[PDB]
A paper describes a structure:
In line with the two-domain architecture shared by OspC-family members, the overall structure of [name] takes a “V”-like shape, in which the N-terminal domain (NTD) and the C-terminal domain (CTD) act as the two arms.
Here, we investigated the OspC3 homologue [name] from [name], an opportunistic but sometimes deadly bacterial pathogen. [name] bears the same arginine ADP-riboxanase activity as OspC3, but with a different substrate specificity. The analyses additionally revealed that [name] preferably modifies apoptotic caspases including [name], -8 and -9.
Numbering used by the authors:
A (entry chain A): 45 to 161, 171 to 487
B (entry chain C): 83 to 146
C (entry chain B): 56 to 187, 213 to 229, 239 to 277, 286 to 303
Amino acid sequence: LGSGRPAAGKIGAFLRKAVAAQSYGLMFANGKLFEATGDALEKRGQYGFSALQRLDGLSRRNLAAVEARLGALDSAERGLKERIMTGAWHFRHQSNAALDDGKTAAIASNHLLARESGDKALLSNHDFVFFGVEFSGRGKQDKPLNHKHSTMDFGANAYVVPDTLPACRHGYLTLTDHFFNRVPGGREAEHQDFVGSFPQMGAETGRWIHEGKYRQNAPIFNYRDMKAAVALHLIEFLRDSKDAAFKAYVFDQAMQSGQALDRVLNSVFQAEFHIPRLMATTDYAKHPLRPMLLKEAVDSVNLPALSGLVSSKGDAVTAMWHAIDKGKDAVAAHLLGNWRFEAGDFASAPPGFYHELNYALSEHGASVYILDQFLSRGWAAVNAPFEHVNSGETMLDNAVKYGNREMAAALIKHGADRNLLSEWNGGKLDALLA
Amino acid sequence: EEEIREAFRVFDKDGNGYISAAELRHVMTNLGEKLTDEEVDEMIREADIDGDGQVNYEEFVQMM
Amino acid sequence: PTYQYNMNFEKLGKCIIINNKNFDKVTGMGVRNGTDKDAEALFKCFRSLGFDVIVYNDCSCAKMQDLLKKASEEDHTNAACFACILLSHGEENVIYGKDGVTPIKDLTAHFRGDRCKTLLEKPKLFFIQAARIPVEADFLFAYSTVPGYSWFVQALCSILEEHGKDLEIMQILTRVNDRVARHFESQSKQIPCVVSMLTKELYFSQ
């Protein structure tokens, strides 16, 4: 019971400091945008702590850049800075997948899903969890103010965590979307009624946000400099603004209320917070914002929600076509037993599907599980060629075309005539069988 | 900064160098700061440079 | 001559859409994401005009050659014209197949006036989308080397779905050049070129 129990926190504070250094190590090393500005880094098998040291180095540069742009702050501007500096934030992440179990909410990044099975080359920040930043400060169980970030409705469930989580000590924030660094105009903004009351502002919101000489140099700030950045970058816009009504709403009503401050910061910018690798915690809040639809759950694999969304055999057929196209296996397994279809159910083409049955099962990235279980029940013909897309070709034609060795194995296992392929396939089949 | 090298050694399974990997799993699972069991998996993945079941606290601080 | 192509036929003509989305590792090219949305917009748009649209996805160089070769050998007596759409990668006078490259001259080789009498005196439309030239008679090319987040295909459909049955083909493609020119300024001055060997004006009557 000596000095080991408090020092036991080093294990964890050091591991979260090493795991976070890998996600940033992927962003600086593999980021094409960081090479043009020279902010890129070296290449290692396990990126060291120098990746986090350049995060603080990059944050101090962007902070001192906007600090030198304004410098002489007005007296009323100093109070607005401390207002945002002292205001606690709530980070909002939306999606359609059930990411919690009622006790712990685990949200993995876009890169951690790859180890388990354009924009990715420009930034290489897909090893981070995306969050929409709310500046209300009215509690974590409070209703989410904003439903969309950069005109993107991510999902029907909102997972909110306060900035008190230890994982936020290593995160970073961009003023808008790190890729598309253009806060949209008034017509695209979410809360239209608030922006409509300020006319001369709606023409100044449609802008590109940047800092360096390159237009795409989206400003990046660490946790230590988040509040000091969004405050100064707001003052930089308020000083250039000609709107006499909006230049008075930020100094009067916005500093008093937390909701008015969010409407200002969510309209001037589109703040995006990122957490490396994984965001697993028990202190969170889940608010169902809107009802979820059928296609929303099939793509994100939300089987518990999908059980109630299907209330008829037609909705079950419609849900099956979405699993075939997007290539989800478990979604087809639940619909398999709960609803017993027939062969003529999937015979026609549903409205909104620009591919037919046989081609979707043989498309690029299609699942053999969706295909094998479909031919085992005999709900589709084995050698009937397509009559709408790539006509004159069979199931095995696409299987050998893309080179999928496993898809061609099951098609012949169900009796595929090897002599029904066109000339552009011929004898390449034997190189894929074994 | 330099005191981090002492931080792992206070609860080393042996004396110097190799530390038990499953020990660091249950340490963060209960003792120390109350961490989440879902996060514990990803912390040990990048930690064990050997990639089997051990801890190299001496080299890990030097490499990073 | 009425300075206007004769559109008094049964069917408007054939329309082939090549949609090469995935490519082999030997080519070293990436997947063209979003081209399925371009192929769907071009299908329902040209089908609305009156074409017999048939779509082919991820065709090899030998498949594309034989596809247009067998198309030019078809009977186009009851066809008012003919159209071809290409969606793949490209470089210089060549587009990318799934297994290599093929030149544009070979795709229009069997469509010359001597090698296709049924389409003689009828316009052969060619719309090319190549990211990163033969001069005959009654031919039209829509060459676009601008990648999109595509802007060209969406601007072509948005005008043909609004003025495809009331304006001439150059009025359509001219407004398409202005629409894509606006996107270079909004960023959400590269412009496609129109090579025209038409002898008459092109309207889309039934």
